[PDB]
Design a protein around this ligand. Structure first.
Ligand SMILES: CCC[C@@H](C)[C@H]1CC[C@H]2[C@@H]3[C@H](O)C[C@@H]4C[C@H](O)CC[C@]4(C)[C@H]3C[C@H](O)[C@]12C
Ligand SMILES: CCC[C@@H](C)[C@H]1CC[C@H]2[C@@H]3[C@H](O)C[C@@H]4C[C@H](O)CC[C@]4(C)[C@H]3C[C@H](O)[C@]12C
Ligand SMILES: [Mg+2]
Ligand SMILES: [Zn+2]
Ligand SMILES: [Zn+2]
Lengths: 47, 513, 1336
């Protein structure tokens, strides 16, 4: 209950890189080239 | 900026949480919180650690530790300093005369031989040699060869080692003599310069070079200048100062410029000693703080312990020599521990307990701990006396020490935040009924004493201080009544007998019991 | 003896003058002999001898040689109490700053030096140097020079350079500072260019420099050089039983200060390194700071018990300080307490006192009597006699008690009736007997309560108790005029049972000769207490100037009424007792007796009523059984029907026909209806019974059921409790505030099961907690109310003013809920009450309106009077008796000296714990329209053309009975000047969309209307019509954004139609989001809708209404009369400008666009009108409307909170608090006075200042009144002794000391602290005489 700090700091304090953090907390989409994208029907719930 | 956002939020809501204030922001945090509550304005809106210990740590930090050789140089510096002042004071004449007079007084059995001197670089033989040199040198003041004789006298005087107390006494005596000379000189300068605008150039030309005769002032009065004419009005005080200076010159037996140069060298040496000692202590502050962390909960606050430790270090650094080779961290810890322990034993409890009694209490506590661990249950006063070698009454007396006074604000009510001090009564107040009884007794005595011949009433009021300013004896009331100490006793006895039987004194019987 | 108190700063010379010696050692006492040490904190030389007339050694130990200083010890031979009066001093080695003048919020030191507080702190803690009068060497005074900067500046400067560090630098700064010259410089600055804050800051600086110059202090006195030492006996080291001691925390703090000071003095001789001396000086500053105030700058120093030590400051402030714990309330001699019992045999003026308590409390009186009568010779014999409790002692005690009042008090003293004086009657036992009728005054029940008893000592105190506080003097409440001595619960039941007829009782139809025969028949068993008979009654009337003429006639009554008539005094009629006599009939009876006859007959009557009620309640033998709780026979049917309906609703919802948010409400309504039906059936079955008969036929009569009798008479209970006993327990709530849908369908005659009881517990816990919280809040409100308005006192007989409030009945739309009699009774008319026919004066002037005048006014049917009020009183420093009214507790015009502020505060705070479209007329009268412009619409009826139209129903008697508000543009069936019948809806309107309507008829053309710049194309597909919707400024293009839609009216001849009666063109600038429906060229009838524009309570309401808080969205009022206009748009908020008819127009306000304005830019408005709509503000009303309008808004807005809960208090008490709220005036023009332009001054001072000045050859100063809250208005006290009592002590003493303030005790809270007579009551004459002699 001391002065507030951004949460991600602690993640870095556990020896986590930014790429690893984004991998843990987020999903990803990909593209191919021209400029073709692999469509996943479920993801596009609003488009 | 950041404070402005928190203030805006607080104004909008009228209240704030600890987390919000802390994020948007130990002693600095408390100070900021206190400032924020100010509004619930302009001064607070516009508005290091404040801990006396953190600032001390900061100010100490800007220091460099000393290695083994790092002390040696400093040490030698100190010696040079002291050596210099010795050579500065070896030339003072009156010092040797005072030493000889004190030695003669000691020889008159007024003090121990050894207390006078801490040896030399045998004591009676060296004193005899010193006396011989003094007698052969004092009677040869004749200028041409006297300087070499005085130099030899001082050189042989150097072989001696003097007690610090009397050496410091001689130094202080020389200092006060120089202070008197300088005060007279300053009075002369103020009465001649400020009062008459006497140029400094004339003072240098005349005062300097001789500084003994009155030609520098008396003969300058006819220089044909306004300051010379104005010096007539203040010529009396300047002449008196000149006479005092001439008298002092006899004592000094030296040129005042030489005295000034000697004092300058002494001051330089003293400053060198001082700077060396400061450099040494600044480094050793770390040792002082390191030692004084084993006495935290003893009644003294950490900083007081640190300051007492600093006194001990300053004493050691003055009593440390590199001949022995003790790494300071071994000759110094002892003084630090001694000082801290004595200070704790002198200013740690409100009702002061002497040092020896503190040691006795600590020893008793240690023995009690050992006994409790060993036997298992507890030691009793008889067993404590047996194990501690005491009459078993001293043990009880030591156990009866008053411990530590209870804070008078200790919340004891537990129902209305009552304090222990609300339940302590005033035991010296006189009950209102006893005051009324005293007044009634006075009235009864006044009533009864009016029922006998005026002479008897006067005698009884004279003997017993009834309404009188003070008591009186038989002979004084006899002087009052022109009789001698016998008829007065008889009349007093008659009156007491008259008041004795009932029907004349019955309410008094009621007062009696 | 002194008559004033002065406060200032102490010079070192002054501190050395107080002291008798210097404390040099930190020692207190020897650990072996326990004697004071030498030069220690407890020293006999410095502070005096330890025992009366005795040196420390003992060589001098007699009174005979007093005043001599023993040579061995040096201890003066005097009284030991002198140790309680002598101070010492400690000469600090180095100066120390005073924490009060450093860490205060304004930071007096920094303010005076004009330096930031952080600079001062860092220089204090030996961080950076400061240049003091550096000189012409390129240095600036008060410049921070860190160690390195100072070192490099010292080089190249052979001059001294005048730089220092620590508190010595601050002291040198303060001592060098010159105040007159700096004040002159600041005057020069103020003369030249002025900025928004530059002029303000320079004025503040010059003013505070002037104040400090005039106070007589010197700045350098803020830096301590000598420290005073408190006398030893106020910080005692006292032996406790055993070898233990107890000591005050001040001994520790003084020991620390002395230890560090001595260590520093020792250290400065060793020539230590500067690090050490700097640390020592920092520690010394810290220790002195901790001593003066611990826990304010850093961390609080703690002791062995690991608690923060109490400092000197901590001994003054707080609820446990000298100012509050001991000076305003303390323990008292000659007092006792005990449990209270009933004692129903007593008289209203006497109580029952145990013999043991009476013997203990009156001991000195008994000693005096025994000695006087010769029973005892000395006081010791008397003591022994009373200790043995001989026989003569009790006769002496009975003689002492004869006529000696005692004050009885109960702990929660909410009003002044919580202390009352009674005459003791000695009883056996150990409980106090309290008269029943007084219980309600104390709020006391006999289930374990306790009372305290005090005995007045002096003749004056006894006479005050007999004449002011006696229980027979306080029979009327002081909050209103109603009696507070009403019989409560069992007297009421007895009198109800006695006077309660029955259909066919024994001895019915008899004809008695009077009350005596009725009692003789009832008592011998020949008649029933309720048998309808004819009795010859003789009653007296004051149909003369007090003559009591008699009339004898045969009344038709019962035996009970005839018997009860024996106790009624002469003047009253027989119709008072000729009824059922519930709870309120008895109170009306007592009130009638008091007003007609007086005080003594009322007291006698009340006692007789109590006795008769108790006797006949016992006689009836009324009990409570389980058969008295009659459950309805149809309850099961009602519950089953409700179950069926709710089940049908649930299954309908299961079919997806209704949203759950609506089925919930449907179920709630079903259960509410079922509960109402069950309650109605129960009450119908329980309130009537069949009896037979004079001839033999069934006849109904009111029930004699016991529960119904208790509820109906008002003795105890209600319809809700009976509903829970025999109906159904009802509908419970939830912790979230929701109402659980399924109710408790069981009563208490039947049992609850586990779940129903669980819900009941949910409710009960919350009830208890809420009670506790309400009791907590209602005390804080009362404390604030007393603090703000304590010193108000009646101090004049007539100010002569001709102004006052306009009293008229209060009407909330429909019926009237407070007649004129309640609001006008007991006040003083400010103007002649002309007859409603305007013939002659009905009530001349300055006539206290008592009951007769109120009856006269009611008879003539006047509905508006002008009554003098406190808030408009011309008296200075107090109020006059004529502008107040009458006492309300004595019945006559209030007396001079009476403290009305405390009474007002107590009356307002005492009831705190209790408190938690279309228009249809209703009577046959005449419609009267006020503030409305009329016109005839196309239909031929009358349409309102105003925003403040008021409709009143003036009956044939000319009295208003129904007041209604009608919005703009409503069709009226009838109008003014035409009689109407009942049930006629004289007005109706559409409460939707917008009331935008036109005023004339004719062809409409879209003047200054371009498509694509101000409108959008949205055709009405449903109807096929084309409508031009006006978009907003943002969406529309800039091509025509500045243009507005104007629809001019034209004719078929091509001319222009203008506004009738004026040449102003007829254009309507419609705002954004306006749907234009009608096309151009389509004639419109009058009033056509051009555009269909779319769209607390309880105690906290009272507390936030006396604090003058501003609501969330205050409705905007018209700042100035003039044509409304607009300026630059969308500059954060919409801008509006009002241009007067001729006057300048410097007013412009950033009105937010969110607010839905109710005025168009082409419509003039006068000041005080509403532009927006919403809650009003208390401050805006005072500024726009006079003082009489803000007071009216308050005395009516807080009286609504009390009326809902049934609490009634007089309006006098709310106008007393308001008078103290708006008490400061702000000056606008200085005039020929000596007042600054922008200054706040007491309104009393400015009023008299220009009054005398105007009488001379000068001109007075204008001003504007200001309104504050009760917490901000109580901080403007002009005495620093009453202010420190309830404000922050540290702030008040710090500012009063620098200002050199002196206060002459003139209030009620200051003479209590000092211990002299208050200037309010019996002490009012004493103070006036003192002022008279002092003036001489
Ligand atoms: C929370 C309240 C604490 C308070 C009730 C406790 C805490 C310490 C207790 C005192 C101390 O022991 C010192 C004394 C010892 C003697 O033998 C009896 C008296 C003496 C004052 C004690 C009484 C009491 O028991 C005290 C005040
Ligand atoms: C529940 C509160 C306890 C309180 C009523 C009891 C518990 C301990 C009692 C005090 C201590 O004994 C220390 C002192 C002893 C002296 O002899 C008389 C005074 C002294 C303060 C006592 C008065 C009182 O009786 C105390 C506070
Ligand atoms: Mg109770
Ligand atoms: Zn003595
Ligand atoms: Zn008045």
């Amino acid at each position: 209950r001391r002065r507030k700090l951004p949460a991600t700091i602690i993640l870095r304090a556990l020896n986590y890189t930014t790429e690893q953090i984004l991998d843990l907390f987020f999903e990803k989409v990909i593209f191919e080239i021209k400029l073709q994208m692999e469509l996943v029907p479920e993801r596009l719930r609003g488009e | 900026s950041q404070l402005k956002l928190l203030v805006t939020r607080g104004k909008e809501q009228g209240y704030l949480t600890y987390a919000e204030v802390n994020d948007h922001l130990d002693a600095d945090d408390l100070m900021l919180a206190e400032n924020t509550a100010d509004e619930d304005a302009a001064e607070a809106a516009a508005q290091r650690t404040t801990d006396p210990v953190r600032m001390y740590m900061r100010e100490m930090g800007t220091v460099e530790l000393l290695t083994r050789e790092g002390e040696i140089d400093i040490a030698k510096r100190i010696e040079d300093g002291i050596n210099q002042v010795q050579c500065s004071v070896a030339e003072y004449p009156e010092a040797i005369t005072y030493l000889l007079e004190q030695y003669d007084r000691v020889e008159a059995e007024e003090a121990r031989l050894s207390d006078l001197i801490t040896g030399f670089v045998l004591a009676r033989e060296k004193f005899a040699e010193l006396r011989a040199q003094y007698v052969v040198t004092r009677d040869t003041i004749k200028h041409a060869t006297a300087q070499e004789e005085i130099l030899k006298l001082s050189e042989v005087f150097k072989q001696f080692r003097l007690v610090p107390k009397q050496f410091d006494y001689l130094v202080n005596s020389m200092r006060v003599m120089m202070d008197r000379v300088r005060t007279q000189e300053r009075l002369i300068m103020k009465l001649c310069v400020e009062q008459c605008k006497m140029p400094k150039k004339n003072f240098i030309t005349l005062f300097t070079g001789n500084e003994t005769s009155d030609t520098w002032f008396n003969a300058a009065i006819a220089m044909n200048k306004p300051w010379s004419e104005k010096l007539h009005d203040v010529s009396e005080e300047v002449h008196r100062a000149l006479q005092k200076l001439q008298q002092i010159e006899e004592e000094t037996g030296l040129t005042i410029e030489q005295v000034k140069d000697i004092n300058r060298r002494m001051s330089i040496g003293e400053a060198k000693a001082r700077r060396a000692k400061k450099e040494m202590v600044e480094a050793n502050l770390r040792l002082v703080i390191s030692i004084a962390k084993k006495y935290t909960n003893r009644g003294l606050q950490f900083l007081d312990l640190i300051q007492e430790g600093n006194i001990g270090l300053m004493k050691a650094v003055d009593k440390f020599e590199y001949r022995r080779g003790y790494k300071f961290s071994t000759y110094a810890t002892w003084w630090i521990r001694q000082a801290i322990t004595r200070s704790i034993a002198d200013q740690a409890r409100t009702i002061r307990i002497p040092v020896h009694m503190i040691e006795t209490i600590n020893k008793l506590n240690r023995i009690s701990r050992q006994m409790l661990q060993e036997m298992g249950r507890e030691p009793t006063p008889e067993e404590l006396a047996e194990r501690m070698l005491m009459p078993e009454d001293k043990i009880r007396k030591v156990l009866k020490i008053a411990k530590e006074p209870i804070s008078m604000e200790t919340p004891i009510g537990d129902d209305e935040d009552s304090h222990l001090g609300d339940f302590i009564e005033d035991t010296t107040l006189e009950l209102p009924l006893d005051s009324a009884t005293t007044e009634s007794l006075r009235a009864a005595t006044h009533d009864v004493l009016a029922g006998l011949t005026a002479r008897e009433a006067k005698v009884l009021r004279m003997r017993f201080g009834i309404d009188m300013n003070t008591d009186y004896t038989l002979e004084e009331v006899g002087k009052q009544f022109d009789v001698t100490r016998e008829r007065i006793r008889q009349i007093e006895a008659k009156a007491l007998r008259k008041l004795r039987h009932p029907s004349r004194s019955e309410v008094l019987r009621s007062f009696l019991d | 003896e002194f008559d004033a108190i002065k406060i200032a700063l102490a010079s070192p010379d002054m501190i050395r003058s107080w002291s008798f010696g210097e404390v040099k050692k930190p020692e207190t006492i020897n650990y072996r002999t326990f004697k004071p040490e030498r030069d220690g904190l407890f020293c006999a030389r410095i502070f005096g001898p330890v025992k009366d007339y005795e040196c420390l050694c003992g060589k001098y130990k007699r009174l005979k040689h007093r005043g001599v200083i023993c040579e061995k010890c040096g201890v003066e031979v005097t009284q030991t109490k002198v140790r309680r009066e002598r101070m010492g001093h400690i000469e600090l080695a180095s100066p120390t700053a005073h924490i009060w003048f450093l860490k205060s919020l304004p930071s007096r030191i920094g303010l005076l030096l004009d330096m930031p507080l952080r600079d001062i702190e860092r220089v204090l803690y030996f961080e950076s140097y400061v240049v003091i009068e550096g000189g012409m060497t390129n240095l600036e005074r008060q410049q921070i020079l860190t160690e390195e900067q100072y070192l490099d500046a010292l080089e190249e400067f052979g001059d001294e350079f005048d730089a220092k560090m620590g508190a010595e630098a601050i002291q040198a700064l303060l001592k060098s500072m010159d105040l007159e010259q700096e004040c002159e410089q600041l005057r020069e600055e103020l003369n030249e260019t002025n900025s928004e804050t530059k002029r303000k800051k320079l004025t503040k600086r010059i003013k505070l420099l002037e104040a400090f110059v005039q106070s007589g202090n010197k700045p350098e006195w803020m830096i301590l050089t000598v420290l005073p030492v408190l006398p030893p006996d106020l910080r005692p080291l006292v032996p406790l039983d055993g070898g233990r001691f107890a000591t005050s925390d001040l001994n520790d703090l003084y020991r620390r200060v002395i230890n560090r000071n001595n260590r520093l003095k020792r250290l400065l001789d060793l020539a230590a390194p500067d690090i050490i001396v700097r640390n020592e000086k920092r520690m010394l500053q810290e220790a002195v700071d901790a001593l003066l105030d611990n826990g304010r700058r850093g961390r609080a120093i703690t002791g062995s018990n690991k608690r923060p030590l109490k400092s000197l400051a901590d001994m003054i402030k707080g609820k446990q300080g000298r100012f509050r714990q001991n000076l305003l309330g303390k323990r008292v001699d000659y007092s006792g307490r005990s449990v209270i019992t009933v004692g129903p045999y007593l008289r209203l003026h006497q109580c029952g006192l145990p013999k043991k308590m009476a013997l203990e409390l009156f001991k000195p009186f008994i000693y005096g009597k025994l000695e006087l009568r010769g029973l005892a010779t000395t006081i010791k014999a008397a003591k022994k006699m009373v200790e043995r409790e001989e026989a003569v002692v009790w006769d002496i005690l009975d003689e002492v008690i004869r006529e000696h009042p005692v004050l009885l008090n109960r702990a929660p003293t909410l009003h002044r009736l919580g202390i009352q004086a009674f005459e003791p009657v000695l009883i056996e036992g150990k409980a106090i007997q309290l008269h029943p009728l007084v219980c309600a005054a104390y709020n006391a029940d006999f289930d374990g309560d306790q009372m305290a008893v005090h005995v007045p000592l002096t003749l004056e105190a006894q006479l005050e108790a007999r004449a002011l506080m006696m229980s027979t003097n306080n029979i009327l409440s002081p909050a209103n005029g109603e009696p507070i001595i009403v019989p409560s619960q069992d007297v009421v039941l007895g009198l109800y049972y006695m006077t309660r007829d029955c259909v066919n009782a024994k001895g019915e139809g008899m004809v008695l000769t009077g009350p005596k025969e009725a009692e003789r028949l009832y008592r011998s068993g020949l008649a029933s207490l309720h048998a309808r008979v004819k009795v010859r009654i003789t009653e007296y009337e004051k149909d003369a100037n007090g003559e009591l003429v008699a009339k004898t006639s045969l009344k038709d009554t019962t035996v009970g009424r005839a018997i009860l008539w024996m106790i009624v005094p002469k003047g009253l009629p027989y119709s008072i007792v000729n009824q059922a006599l519930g709870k309120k009939a008895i109170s009306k009876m007592l009130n009638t007796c008091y007003r007609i006859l007086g005080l003594k007959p009322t007291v006698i009557f009340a006692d007789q009523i109590m006795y008769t009620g108790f006797a006949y309640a016992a006689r009836s033998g009324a009990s409570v059984g389980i058969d008295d709780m009659v459950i309805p026979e149809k309850k099961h049917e009602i519950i089953s029907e409700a179950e069926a309906e709710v089940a049908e609703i649930q299954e309908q919802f299961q079919s997806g026909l209704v949203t759950a948010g609506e089925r919930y409400n449907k179920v709630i309504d079903i259960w509410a209806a079922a509960n109402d039906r069950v309650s109605k059936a129960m009450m119908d079955n329980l309130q009537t019974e069949t009896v037979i008969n004079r001839d033999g036929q069934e006849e109904k009569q009111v029930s004699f059921n016991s529960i119904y009798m208790m509820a109906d008479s008002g003795a105890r209970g209600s319809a809700a409790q009976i509903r829970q006993l025999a109906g159904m327990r009802g509908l419970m709530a939830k912790p979230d505030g929701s109402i659980i849908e399924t109710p408790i369908t069981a009563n208490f005659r039947e049992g609850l099961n586990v779940l129903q009881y669980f819900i009941s517990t949910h409710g009960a816990r919350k009830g208890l907690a809420d009670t506790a919280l309400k009791t907590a809040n209602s005390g804080y409100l009362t404390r604030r109310l007393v603090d703000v308005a304590q010193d108000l006192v009646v101090t004049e007989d007539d100010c002569g003013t001709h102004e006052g409030i306009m009293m008229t009945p209060v009407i909330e739309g429909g019926d009237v809920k407070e007649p004129l009699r309640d609001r006008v009774l007991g006040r003083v008319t400010a103007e002649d009450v002309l007859k409603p026919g305007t013939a002659d004066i009905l009530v001349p002037r300055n006539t206290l309106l008592h009951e007769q005048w109120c009856d006269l006014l009611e008879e003539n049917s006047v509905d508006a009077v002008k009554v003098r009020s406190v808030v408009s009183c011309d008296t200075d420093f107090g109020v006059c008796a004529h502008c107040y009214g009458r006492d309300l507790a004595r019945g006559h015009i209030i007396n001079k000296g009476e403290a009305i502020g405390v009474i007002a505060a107590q009356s307002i705070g005492e009831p705190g714990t209790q408190l938690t479209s279309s228009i249809q007329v209703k009577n046959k009268g005449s419609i009267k329209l006020s503030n409305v412009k009329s016109v005839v619409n196309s239909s031929g009826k009358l349409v309102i053309t105003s925003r403040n139209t008021e409709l009143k129903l003036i009956d044939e008697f000319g009295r208003t009975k129904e007041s209604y508000k009608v919005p703009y543009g409503a069709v009226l069936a009838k109008g003014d000047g035409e009689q109407v019948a009942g049930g006629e809806t004289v007005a109706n309107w559409d409460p939707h969309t917008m009331p935008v309507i036109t005023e004339v008829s004719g062809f409409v053309r879209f003047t200054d209307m371009i498509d694509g710049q101000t409108i959008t194309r949205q055709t009405d597909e449903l109807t096929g019509l084309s409508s031009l919707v006006v978009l907003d400024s943002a969406e529309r293009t800039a091509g025509g954004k500045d243009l507005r839609p104007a629809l001019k009216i034209v004719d078929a001849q091509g001319n222009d139609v203008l506004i009738p009666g004026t040449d102003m063109p007829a254009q309507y600038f419609l705002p954004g989001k306006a749907i234009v429906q009608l096309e151009d060229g389509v004639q419109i009838s009058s009033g056509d809708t051009l555009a269909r524009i779319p769209q607390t309570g309880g105690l906290p309401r009272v507390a936030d209404l006396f604090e003058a808080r501003r609501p969330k969205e205050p409705a905007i009022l018209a700042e100035i009369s003039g044509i409304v206009s607009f300026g630059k748009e969308t500059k954060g908020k919409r801008r509006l400008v009002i241009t007067p008819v001729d006057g300048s127009d410097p007013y412009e306000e950033m009105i937010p666009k969110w607010r839905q304005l109710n005025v168009f830019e082409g419509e003039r408005v006068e000041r005080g009108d509403v532009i927006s709509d919403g809650p009003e503000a208390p401050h805006d009303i005072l500024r726009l409307r006079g003082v009489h309008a803000v007071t009216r808004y308050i005395v009516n807005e807080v009286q609504d909170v009390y009326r809902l809960q049934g609490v009634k208090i007089n309006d006098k008490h709310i106008e007393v608090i308001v008078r103290q709220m708006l008490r400061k005036a702000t000056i606008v023009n200085a005039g020929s006075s000596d007042f600054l332009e922008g200054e706040q001054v007491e309104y009393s001072r400015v009023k008299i200042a220009n009054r005398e000045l105007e009488a001379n050859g000068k001109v007075g100063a204008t001003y504007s009144r200001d309104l504050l809250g009760i917490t901000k208005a109580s901080l403007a006290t002009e005495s620093f002794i009453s202010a420190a009592s309830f404000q922050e002590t540290t702030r008040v003493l710090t500012e009063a000391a620098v200002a050199g303030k002196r206060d002459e005790l003139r209030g009620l809270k200051e003479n209590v602290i000092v211990g002299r007579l208050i200037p309010a009551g019996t002490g009012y004459a004493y103070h006036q005489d003192r002022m008279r002699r002092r003036a001489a």
